[PDB]
Symmetry: C2
Subunit: 112 residues, 2 copies
C-alpha cells in the first residue's frame, strides 16, 4: 500500500531517515511486534499507541493505549471563533511557517 504519511524522529544525528506509513494502521510500542518498536525503552508501554488513516474520510488519527498517555504538540487555527486557553499554550497573533522572524508569539499562564 502506497505511503500516505511519514514520521521523523527529532533530535537524532544528522541523516535520520523518515519512517513511511504504508499501512492502514501503524502500531508503536515497546514490544518487538509493533511497527515502530522501542524494546529497550522502559518508559514506553508494550503497546503505547497506534496511528490510523481513514480510507473514507481520509482523516488521520492517533489512539493512545499506554498506561500514562501520549503527548502531542499541535498548532490550532482560531478564525472568528472561541477557543479554550490553558497554561503553556502560545498565542501567535502573527504566524509565518516560512518566516518565524515575523512571528508575534505570547506564552499564556494562569496565576490562579
Amino acid at each position: 500500500m502506497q505511503p500516505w504519511g511519514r514520521l521523523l524522529r527529532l533530535g537524532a544525528e544528522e541523516g535520520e531517515p523518515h519512517v513511511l506509513l504504508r499501512k492502514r494502521e501503524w502500531t508503536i510500542g515497546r514490544r518487538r511486534g509493533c511497527d515502530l518498536s522501542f524494546p529497550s525503552n522502559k518508559l514506553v508501554s508494550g503497546d503505547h499507541c497506534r496511528i490510523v488513516v481513514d480510507e473514507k474520510s481520509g482523516q488521520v488519527t492517533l489512539e493512545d493505549t499506554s498506561t500514562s498517555g501520549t503527548v502531542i504538540n499541535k498548532l490550532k487555527v482560531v478564525k472568528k471563533q472561541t477557543c479554550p486557553l490553558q497554561t503553556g499554550d502560545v498565542i501567535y497573533l502573527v504566524y509565518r511557517k516560512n518566516e518565524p522572524e515575523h512571528n508575534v508569539a505570547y506564552l499564556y499562564e494562569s496565576l490562579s
Copy 2:
C-alpha cells in the same frame, strides 16, 4: 482586580516583562485602544482577538475577531483515547519537561 493570568512575548531580549491580566476581558489588536496594542504592526487586525475568564466557571477562552485568524500552539495529553493528527504535529511517546534528552519525539507529515 487581582491578576488571574499573564502573557509573555517570546523571542525578545532578556528582561521582557510579563503582561498581567487584571480584567475579565483583555482585548488584543493593532488599534491603540486595545489592552495589548500593536500600532505599528500591519499584520495585526484592528481588533485581533480577545482573552476572557468566565466569572462563573473560571475557564479561560480566546476569541478571534481578526481578518485572517489567530494561531495557538498546544501541548495536548492523550490518555486512553483517540485524537486527530495533522501535518506538523509532534508526537511525544515520552515527554519530560525540561528533560528533553529523554524525550522520544516524532514529527508527523502527510504525503497525501
